[PDB]
Symmetry: T
Subunit: 152 residues, 12 copies
């Protein structure tokens, strides 16, 4: 209604092995890169007055240090921790320590894979979780974050 | 679109979701399952998606609706609510008719009691959305369109 | 003229069989005899008791939905649905009417799957193994909570 | 011999047999099975009745209605094997002997399917022999009731 | 009717009732409860005796002393429910029927509290109904002993 | 003149004791009576049945090895080796002859270690608790699979 | 004139009840009869036997403390404290006197919580299910270890 | 008194006793033990026979051959305690009472060794008392059979 | 201090700690529980902390001492020894009187048998010290002073 | 008694997220930084002829490499591994490999938090463990190390 | 070598390995246990290793061969096949004669069913090789020579 | 037979703490370094027309990034993940993502140590596993890789 939203500052964090997307047998498994996904997500965010920053890393410390740098500069996090979902208590405690709401995203439906993959050190503290929807899960998390911060 | 083929989508809601918006609206929120399915119907009709909906406290009525969907429906969105944790019969219904589905939960089950972590559906769903509220239905609808139209 | 308590008694599956197989071997008492006796005891205390027994999970859930802002208290013997119905747990949490859980038999003396309840942890309390007087104890207990004696 | 009264109960999803990819998974319906089983029973002075249902309550209430009408039950509870304590308590409460049948080998599928709320109180269990499991259960019931 | 001899046993920490933040948690003592229960018993020709103790041995030796003096036991073993096999073996050894009572709903507290070394051999169990649980157990004992 | 089926029946330990302890208390029937009856029923269907019972794990394994390209189907009551012999599981997987598993008693009603089988998951199916007719049902079932009726 | 062995026999809770409920139904024998018999058998072997039975956990612990450098060997039937007393385990480890654990009944045939002992793993050994002769076997065994025959 | 017929069965690896580092672990053989036990039995009009074997089948078939020849069995099944359901079913099937003996304290070794397929159906179990465990089991069998 | 308020501190020791220093002093050490409580009393008296102590092999004597501490004691230091693993009644005593405590163990329980990893007290203690020997009591005392004097 | 102690070389290692101390709602949760704690610990150590070195890190490799560099240069370690307690077998094997005694310290009482936090890949090999005492747990570990190395 | 001392090595193979190369050679491979032991004998004889071999479906024949190895054999290579998961008696045979061994499996058990992850032998073996095929025997032989000749 | 093998490109990866080999009480536990082992393995490989590259690291990201760089440049991996066997799902998913066959090697017999060490996030996907054979396990993995790639 008759009022203007301030700019959301949103940080997207991607865990290990997601830099491989689009590279192995592109003709067999798909040609789309993490870069094509972040670029399309950045454009979708900027239409809605969301300023999107992104880090992908194989290095657990680079995600943790980015979350610590987020304190008082970021309103929301979207994170696909990939394999760190199952193993990083450090990341859990980084997100609890800076107290920024987040949504957890997985490309694949982890509930269909090995049974170790069913357990997350993040899901219980996340505002919510999206699994198995491919790249569009990032766009759903973005739509969800805007809704919760603008109460719309 | 007098562009695309009509998708036939079935939305199924499990027990107790009929209570949404009823108790202490001023404390827990005002929105009804009706309001959610009306808004989702409007979103689907703009994309040439024909939405039909059943909520029920009766296990049997969800299973028989899944049976009746065979060769009529392209995709299912289901919030089974408590039946996620208990209904092998709903799992066997979805496997027997072999229509792809997405499982939706309004609340974040991973933050509630630990029995709620277990689903007889998650492992066979094309994917799962938890904790995003009513918009989880609209994400599942956008996902189904994406998969069926390759877009 | 304390206020009239509106109390709902819910019985789960198979309790309709009470008293009916080898009555002279296992006891004579029907669910009917129990609910009649309980209704009379309630009416002496200005408690309006209504009752549904069912083998249909949906009928217990729908009755709990319909109880919202009509009922002060529930006494429930869910029988076998104690062990399996998350949906009934979510119905009682969703309408937020206090209840007590009753079992005629001592479940802790029977097969070990019977030890787990999807209700015991949200009940105001639990009575097991005292037979039909368990309903009468739940009734006395509900009057106590509601009349703050 | 005395006419045996036999009740066959079939649980959820079994109405789907024959219907999806008939050319790939079999063309045979629950109907074809129960017709053949009724004929086999009538040759042995066994009066067979049947109920299939997706509704737990219809199976429970049929077991209640069976008390002092039925000598034996054959039941394929399908998914309810794994979840319905209420059916277990219905069969215990009416105290009719029964046999449990499954068309598929459940031990070869997901490991939740290994647990039954019925197997321990059944006279017997037949898994994985397809529709002939029903006919085995019928021959077994006749044998126990006619001591043969 | 014959005079019933009833023994009430209360386990550790129950002497604390009424004492900490009386205005916040209730002002009612174990004393108030046992006085009221003795009066209720005497109206029904039930001779009630009581022992509360923080000492496991005093409860065990009281159960031994009960043999051929007592018709029924009501016991709130408090924390000993979860830990005392010795009390289980004392009640089995004297073979007096008993009912187990807890003031609070143990199923709503930490999950170690869900296990009892007594629940399976008790005639019955009452949890979470506060002090009236004692009076229910008394009415139940009278009913079984006087067949009413 | 359907083709002659070559069927091997294998019995595990302790089944040699059948009918022998308190015959007038537990039943009269020996393993011998069962195998004779089964052989006759097989011969009516142009099924050539051969049988080995043994308390020796090795003799069951070596008989399954020797069955390779001589036998169309196995009926096996492994008795106590159901719970403990991985080696028999690997023998039936190694020769890749289909089998059905039979138990005279309902194992699911007995001690809870008896619920687990190193065979049930690779069997074409399983029969429990119907006594000696279980062998005759397995035979009828094998003819059905092999003659595609 | 081998050396005099000082042997302490410790009995746990509820063993005072032996022989006393339905003596003509369950057996006549008291703990007293057992300890008298055992004392006589010990005195024939120049074994000085002392005995404490108790329902008090503390009295068994304090007796084990007092045994330090007075006692060569302990025979203990901890009865129900086998399953629950870490403190008794730590008392026997703290004084480092060898013991044997005795149970009259076969605990492995009873409820499955009775299978676990906080003592069996540090005992020199364990006797179950042979009734009162188990004490006499423990005594013969302790003489054997101490007299190296 | 009547002559008792007693069978002693010893499981795998027990033929090794006395043989490796005799000066370090003991010089005593299974032979020395069974000779001493035969002498002790003959003084009490107990006719003792023995079989030790590394072969599961020889123990099972000896238990079958014992039916209506033997009053009592003493068995040290050694490793077969933990693995042979077949031996459990052989002793149940012939219904001869037995006692289980182990030379070592199994509760002090690896935790798989805590489980037995025999302990629950044995008359009794003796662990960790070395060769005298055999002589205790013999005295126990005589006591039960001669009511003494 | 004719500076600070006196803290009233209760030190409770569980079963078998009376044996300290008794068996093979030349092998396992010479120090008695007496020597430890004397040194800890001297340390507390310099800080205007009144220390009272009970060791016992009797469960009941620890529980009744906790009861008697209500409205007399500001803090408890407790080495429950074996009763850590077994006494729900001691847990319910400390929760009923609601005096803050610190749990101390002389040995490192995490390096002994695995049953010793489990405590009916650790989750309610203000904190836990294991494996530091007798000085663990003096650390618990320094911690209690820190918490109660805000220093 | 009538003899002088050599200088102890003591290394304090702090794991992930402990750099956040003092930063979030200081007015609500406390204003004290890891730096104020290490500074006060350094002063307390230097009074007793203990030379204290310190590394805090979000990066698992920096703790491991510091433990390897400690070999033959450090007499004792005090470590608060924070979330790495629950997940780093690498750190366990670094401390076993250099064979320097250590004490494990947690600020919070982990036994009161989620149940995953009850399990440590370190506690069983530690000389001892201190949980829930706040910053003073470091000073207790230091007093304990001096006692064990000087047999006082 | 008229250089080194002869090593006496016993190779033991468990049940069902006699089937190697028999069923669908054109699908699953042509190699027999015979071919493997002949090639391994040739490899051992070039290194002054005397190889003797027993395969058996009989548990007892492996145990009695281990008994007979005492003071005759320097090392054992054993592929127990299914008996890895079930034979406490084979474990107790190897511990009683106290000859060092290496456990070999042709297939990668960690990739098959989860009961196959558990061994009553692995924890006492000097080491374990899985999943490398027939060459696993030749690696175990090279390892035994390395350990016994310090090379 | 009458035909020439192309050059195998083989990558050896060593996890944390393996740089410590040969350094602690060499007189008690052995004097051999990871370097002496890689040097002898390189020589054995080069005799058989195998070009061997090696990275050892305490840093999980350096192993992951090396596996990603291996894609389309390496035919086979030999990896001793050391303690990362028990904890790194990231490494599992790096090896699945580049789809290069590997063999897992441990110096020690992990089945004889603590029971946590019995579980690997790698063993199930490995072509095979070698434990407890010391340094020669690397040479066995190398002989095994040549055999599988040359069908010899």
């Amino acid at each position: 209604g008759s009022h203007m939203t301030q700019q959301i500052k949103l940080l997207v964090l991607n865990g290990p092995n997601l830099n491989l997307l689009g590279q192995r047998e592109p003709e067999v498994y798909g040609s789309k890169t993490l870069d094509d996904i972040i670029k399309a997500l950045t454009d979708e965010a900027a239409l809605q007055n969301v300023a999107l920053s992104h880090l992908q890393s194989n290095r657990e410390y680079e995600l943790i240090e980015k979350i610590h740098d987020a304190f008082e500069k970021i309103d929301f996090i979207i994170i696909n921790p990939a394999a760190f979902t199952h193993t990083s208590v450090a990341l859990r405690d980084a997100l609890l320590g800076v107290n920024i709401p987040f949504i957890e995203v997985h490309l694949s439906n982890v509930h269909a894979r090995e049974s170790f993959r069913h357990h997350s050190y993040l899901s219980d503290i996340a505002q919510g979780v999206i699994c198995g929807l491919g790249a569009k899960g990032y766009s759903f998390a973005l739509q969800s974050a805007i809704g919760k911060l603008r109460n719309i």
